[PDB]
Symmetry: C4
Subunit: 342 residues, 4 copies
């Protein structure tokens, strides 16, 4: 037992403005998901059964990003959804794999469906199972892009890079539907965990991904400046028409079902997630336009023409509970709906 440090999340921190020569319209958002794979926008959608299936992956890829088809469907149906995505336009497609007995069975299936990236995700990425699971997959298909998750420590990044992972997913406990930190007392405040594993990722030359904890466009900006190659989201996308689950109406307003993959309903081990509903946002292209527009804005403040240039010249400052109340709209009664704020 030893208390090492104080760790921070996104709303603990703020990016200090830099001398700018670029405006939000000239900066680029292209990023390298892995060595082979690059994205025109650094956004991914979460490998969950209430966020991403065929229709969502196609939309995300059509916006320059990429989606990860979840793993709560039968093997036959998983390669089939991958098939639908790759067929229409030859877009980027991701498949979620679990450390199971029929692991190589799915991996063999979606590889046949010409998937771009296998991402195997678990609750505990720094484990004996996932490591050898990566080696097993990477042995059969050496050129296949593997993304392993989830971890929260730089030591974990080392062993996954050693195992053969071409990318890493960072974040234990920061999910909006997550209860891991509550029912297991385990996790690292996302921001600290990200820049800890991102810096360790730069040294070995592997990209890391921030997963969960993002509410606004400004949080993604902080994640990127912390060294993250991309950001994966669930709640921001779950209320979009391209997301699975029908529309439910309660008290006049429209909703979509959203739940963790470790909640009681999804696993149909004690639950490490909850189930609820999220506000229906409309079409994805309208949400992404705001997210992209917000990122370009922040990078313009920090005078970064590229995402590489952002990580190098970004400085963080820590705010308190007082500073956090100042950072949000205050002392006014909001009467008109903003497209990027509550």
């Amino acid at each position: 037992a030893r208390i090492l440090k104080t760790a921070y999340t996104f709303d603990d921190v703020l990016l200090v403005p830099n001398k700018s020569e670029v405006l939000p319209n000239e900066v680029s958002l292209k990023t390298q998901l892995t060595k082979k794979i690059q994205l025109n926008i650094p956004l991914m959608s979460a490998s969950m059964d209430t966020v991403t299936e065929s229709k969502m992956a196609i939309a995300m890829a059509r916006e320059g990003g990429i989606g990860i088809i979840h793993k709560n469907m039968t093997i036959e149906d998983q390669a089939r959804e991958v098939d639908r995505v790759k067929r229409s336009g030859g877009l980027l497609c991701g498949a979620s794999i679990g450390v199971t007995n029929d692991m190589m069975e799915r991996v063999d299936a979606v590889v046949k469906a010409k998937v771009d990236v296998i991402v195997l995700d678990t609750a505990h990425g720094h484990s004996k199972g996932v490591i050898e699971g990566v080696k097993r997959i990477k042995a059969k298909y050496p050129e296949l892009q593997v993304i392993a998750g989830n971890i929260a420590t730089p030591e974990a990044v080392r062993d996954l890079a050693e195992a053969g992972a071409d990318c890493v997913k960072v974040g234990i406990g920061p999910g909006s539907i997550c209860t891991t930190r509550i029912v297991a007392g385990v996790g690292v405040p996302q921001l600290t965990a990200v820049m800890d594993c991102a810096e360790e990722g730069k040294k070995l030359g592997i990209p890391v991904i921030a997963d969960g904890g993002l509410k606004y466009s400004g949080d993604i900006v902080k994640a990127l400046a912390a060294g993250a190659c991309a950001a994966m989201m669930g709640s921001i996308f779950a209320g979009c028409e391209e997301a699975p689950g029908a529309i439910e109406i309660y008290q006049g307003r429209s909703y979509k079902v959203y739940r963790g993959m470790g909640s009681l309903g999804a696993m149909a081990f004690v639950p490490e997630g909850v189930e609820g509903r999220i506000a229906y946002k409309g079409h994805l292209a309208d949400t992404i336009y705001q997210l992209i527009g917000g990122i370009k804005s922040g990078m313009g403040y920090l005078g970064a023409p590229t995402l590489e240039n952002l990580y190098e010249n970004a400085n963080f400052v820590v705010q308190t509970s007082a500073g956090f109340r100042e950072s949000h709209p205050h002392d006014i009664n909001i009467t008109k709906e903003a497209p990027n704020y509550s």
Copy 2:
């Protein structure tokens, strides 16, 4: 002079950091040494309050691998009969509460004859003369008897109680969900920091520590254990269970059980109170509640790559979280529409 020492944390303040794991949750073991003789299977205890643990809860707790401490608010006669009812119920572990009183020996006499397994000498201020001389007096008449002394919050207290002959120390001044000691007396050390300190001084003297109070989740236990505690004691968590002495009241179709502190006005009426009196939601049976606690503990231990509790304490690293992180930890920005068995 008045000295400001340091910042002290609780369980909501901190987070454990995932280690490399060769271990799955369904594989770890939660065995512990409550004392040198007594070895619990699961590291859970039930509080010795009149709204948590009578013979019913004690039998249920012992059956699940834990232990129950029968409260002392009843008569010496009525308590010995309670302890007995647990002991002759199938070789189960049982404990009884005592206080620094005049009939302290008469009560210890009664429960020792009821073949009680452990003795809990729990008071408001465990680091006092009355508790120290009390333990020495009990031990003088009953050497082989196992004694737990409380409540403490300092390493200095551990040494004095260990010097007196305590077999285990109970740590916690103010973490109680029904407690108002920190509010009316201004005295108390935030539980996590207090647990760590007493654990450390406890290891060196070869005497285990009990984490009492401040826990409302499974993660709180994982932090309590990783901080060097052998067992965690809970009242609020088990008070909602059907094996609790409280009767099932109903408010607006929802069912509740009454829960009060032993220093609350009602509990003392049997006045300057250091506790409050209220009601909590009815949970159901204990074994269903415990099954959720163990599943959370075993899940957390799988994260720190610990097969045993001793391996957890040795290989545990804590990270301090801000309030901003605390909000991120709990499920946020979602209207939860289905009740989870282990979160509310």
Copy 3:
């Protein structure tokens, strides 16, 4: 030019000590000044909604002392003081403003046999207070004078040299205060009392903790911080011995309570206080019984037979906002009302 982080009572917690003494074995005798002794270290605020004759008579019997407010006629204040004094040798205090007729107001209450005088202005570390205390101690060398309010140990020196026998500490910690908000000035009360007490010990002058004391536990902290006595208005404001008839609002009972720098009380300066209602606490004796019990309990925890030993042995600990949540009752719907804890 940011010095440090300063704490209030809620930021801090007292660490238990080895104790060979029980809560009812401890003594609350204290030293208000060199010559004035209190059986309990509690004083009632000199406000128009808190302390007049009836309150001061009640505080004195219970062991403490009451300070009659100066928001009235010089004749009246001496009339109030006389009522308290002739009631059987009870300690009585009279607050004095720093005004043109400062002395004339004083002369009246020393004739009515007042025991202590307090010179309370919004800023006790100024020219008026300092030369004021000297003007008073010149005519009355034997009269016990309390000056305030201050928040710096530098101000303790300035007032101790002036001739003040005691200093009152607290800038903007009051329940009705807005000084920290409208002026931006003030020092968190635990830090303020700790600093001024230490410098007070070096000079041999008692300090008074004034404002921001919601609970009996807060009093234990201030006493452990070095304060000779605590002063509160919010606590005693609802009591029946306090000025003001009972207002019935929404079926419940209240008394009016307001700052002396509020628009209501000051009837050119901008308001530095608010005006409000506080629940009717019944009689005074009930409330102080709880307070004394809370103080006596905390001293039992810290192994303190006297208030002196308390200060010498006190260890403090800073708690985060998370510890503050587990300090108060949590995870329970409280039904029965606590006579010493409320929400």
Copy 4:
């Protein structure tokens, strides 16, 4: 990517009372807006469309400070507003200029109408556009007084001072209607933001304007004690009757529309501000009277007869959230309304 330090705001700190030979009435609140322009009170109405126009500018100047006519109108109309203020008894007047294609000819027109001060306010003053812009204005009108903003860092003060700016506006994200820190992640908590810029402005000889995040009169004192020469408020003034817009009744209570210059309404796209309604203050003169009462009283505590004596001898102290709770009134049911607290 590294964390710099803890940046505080006004709710984070407290001023410590010094010895005082001066009563609040005996203090002077005069300042230097630039080296050439002086104010009798360090107050300044914000340059937004819903707070300051000719009615407000005259009202502000009549009370002691300046009002700055917003730039959300035609060049002709703005030159006429400046005209309405100047001919109205030779009062101090401020126009507002942005980095735009018609920027120069706009500056030409307001200079013609004898505007006393130009403010070049953009979302990001530490940029190529603003630096080049200030260069041009001083080139054409060497003696014209120009303020530039907004900034948050010392380096930006130097860069603006180098370009000939007579004064700089400090504040990235502290506004009451602001959503910049939320959408971009960019910002510096106003107190240390002002303090660091003020310290470096006093090394060069350039004043700084504490902008935004000022709720109370005490917050203005803290700003002045940190080194700021003047404070700028929109939220405090948008509710007065001299402000633009008609009064609104919602609950039988009077309100006025307050919107950010980067909100959907003001722009006519990605917004950086919100729109809403503020409570109706009434007449500005009675509002200013309360703010002057707070500043002079705060200086009375600090024994400051002047604003420079204030800065020279001002010690700050950080309070926690427990201290913040103690600062505001507590445990009381406020029956009657105070003029300076709500």
